[PDB]
Amino acid sequence: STGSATTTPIDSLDDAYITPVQIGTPAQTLNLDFDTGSSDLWVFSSETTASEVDGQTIYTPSKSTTAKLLSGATWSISYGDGSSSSGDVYTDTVSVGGLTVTGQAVESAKKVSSSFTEDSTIDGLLGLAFSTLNTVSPTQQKTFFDNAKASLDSPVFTADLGYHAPGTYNFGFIDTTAYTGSITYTAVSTKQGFWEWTSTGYAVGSGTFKSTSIDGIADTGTTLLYLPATVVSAYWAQVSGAKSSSSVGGYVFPCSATLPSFTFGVGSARIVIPGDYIDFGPISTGSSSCFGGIQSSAGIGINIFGDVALKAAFVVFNGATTPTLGFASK
Numbered sequence: 001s002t003g004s005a006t007t008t009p010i011d012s013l014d015d016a017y018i019t020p021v022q023i024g025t026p027a028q029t030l031n032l033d034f035d036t037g038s039s040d041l042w043v044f045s046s047e048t049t050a051s052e053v054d055g056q057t058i059y060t061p062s063k064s065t066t067a068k069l070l071s072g073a074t075w076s077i078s079y080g081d082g083s084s085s086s087g088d089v090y091t092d093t094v095s096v097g098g099l100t101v102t103g104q105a106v107e108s109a110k111k112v113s114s115s116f117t118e119d120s121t122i123d124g125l126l127g128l129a130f131s132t133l134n135t136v137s138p139t140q141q142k143t144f145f146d147n148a149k150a151s152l153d154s155p156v157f158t159a160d161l162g163y164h165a166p167g168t169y170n171f172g173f174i175d176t177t178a179y180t181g182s183i184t185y186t187a188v189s190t191k192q193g194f195w196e197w198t199s200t201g202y203a204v205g206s207g208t209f210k211s212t213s214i215d216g217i218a219d220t221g222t223t224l225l226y227l228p229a230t231v232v233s234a235y236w237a238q239v240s241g242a243k244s245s246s247s248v249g250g251y252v253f254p255c256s257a258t259l260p261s262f263t264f265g266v267g268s269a270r271i272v273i274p275g276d277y278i279d280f281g282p283i284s285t286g287s288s289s290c291f292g293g294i295q296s297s298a299g300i301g302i303n304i305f306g307d308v309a310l311k312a313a314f315v316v317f318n319g320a321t322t323p324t325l326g327f328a329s330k
Contacts, residue, residue, distance in 0.1 A: 001151045002172035003099025007034065007161065010121040013280055014307060015223050017161060018121060019169055022095040023106055024064030030057050030123035034169055035221030036159070036195055036317065037304075039133035039143050040077050041094070042085055042107035043124035044116075052112050055120030059108065066102075067092040075107045075135045080222070080300065085112040089136055094144060096126075099171050101148050105134075105141035125221070128157065128317065133193035145171070145319060155319045159220055160330070161311035163277055179314035179328035184269035188323045192302075194219070195317060197325050199305075200267060202227075204235050205260030209270070216303030218310060218317070218325055224280070225262075225273070226297035226304040235262055235294050242292070248283055251292040255282060262294060264309060266327040273312045 007017040018031035023043070030043055044053060046060040061067035067090045076086035087110035094104040109124070116122065127134070131142045149155045152172030160178050161167040168178070189196045194217040201211040214227065232251065236242040238260050242253035253259070259275030278293035293308040316326030 001099055001148075002153055002170070003095075003097035003148075004168060004170045005097030006166050007169055008166045009162065009164065010119070012164070014161075014164060014311065016122060017167070017220070017307070018123075019096070019126070021126060023059050024061070024092050025066040026064075027095070028057075028059055028064065030059060031121065032124045032126040033122050033221060034126045034128055034159075035219070036128040037217060037219035037221045038077065038079065038125060039127040039129045039131055039193065040075060040107050040135055041105065041124070041126045041144055042075065042077070042087070042109055044112070045087070045108040047087060048109045049111055052117045054117050057123045059106065059124075061090045061092065061106075061108065064092055067106075070105065070136075070139075073105075073136050073139060073141075075137070077135045080304075081115070083113045083115040085109045085116060087111065089141070096144065096171065097169065099148055099152075101144055104144055104147055105136060107136065128220070129195065130190050130193045132190070148172075149319055157317050157319070159310060159315045159317065161220065161307055163274075163311050167311070174316060179330045181329055182269075183314070183316055183326040183328040184266045185316070185318070185324045185326045186266055188325055190323060194302075195323070195325055200265030202231055202265065203263040203270075204238050205275075207238075209263065209265070211265070214264075214303055216297075216305050218305050218315060220307060220310060222304045222306030223293075223308070224304075224306050225294045225308040226300055226306065227294060228303065229296045229298045232294055232296045235260070236292065244296075248289070248291070250295040252283060252289045253292055255288045255290040257290075264305075269327065271309070271313045271327055271329060273309060277308055277312060
């Protein structure tokens with residue numbers, strides 16, 4: 001089997017991408033944030049505290065003839081940005097782009113943190129990291145991909161995120177028309193539960209490529225590119241007037257600037273992020289200070305190849321017995 005679904009930016013900055021997911025019988029379609037940095041499929045629901053729902057579409061398990069309470073199971077998750085959610089668990093039928101999994105754990109939110117309530121466009125998350133990170137207790141549950149894998153034509157999914165435009169998540173096949181050149185594959189460590197890999201270096205604009213190992217995660221659920229402070233300083237030094245602002249929370253730059261590209265290495269291959277992908281617009285409405293899309297990871301503990309990096313590539317998440325990642329230009 002295969003599936004193919006369009007993913008759409010939630011706003012004009014590409015802050016996140018939403019993909020329609022069918023849950024239950026008859027189908028209830030919710031727009032979920034596919035997140036290769038986490039491993040829970042959780043949704044706003046009829047059980048979510050009413051004051052914490054503000055415009056999201058909810059899953060109502062009592063209206064699904066295939067829903068079953070997973071007795072005794074609870075979940076609770078905290079994300080790298082400080083947000084969180086928790087609740088109980090149903091199993092139900094879940095379909096993405098024509099690919100159907102029966103008995104998928106659907107984690108129903110009883111509580112969500114304010115950042116979720118305040119984003120009316122995201123109805124939940126669909127985790128695509130390794131199932132060892134799933135938070136369901138006392139019996140850990142499998143991700144949608146893990147449940148689908150054996151049925152897929154090939155045990156892979158691909159992320160093709162758009163710049164200011166829709167893109168595609170495919171399951172079970174590699175669309176050879178969706179990229180240019182070849183796909184370069186690179187080793188993955190699953191020891192932390194992430195799609196963790198090592199970039200071979202970077203370049204700023206037309207500058208020389210610096211060969212250096214940068215361990216990080218491929219994370220579709222993180223907006224920006226978070227890299228070591230040395231790398232980030234070298235990038236922003238090429239933008240006149242750019243500076244790190246403690247009060248704003250990162251590097252800012254004059255909105256009048258033209259940003260240089262940023263290249264990262266994948267083995268001997270190179271992925272070029274155009275400068276425009278690194279512009280996240282005014283820090284507040286009407287400001288001439290703009291927020292940068294490349295930021296320091298120093299306070300995170302891990303480097304993160306988020307959407308800024310991934311949307312410059314066609315990315316293969318190869319879930320074979322020994323997982324690997326592939327990157328192609330497009």
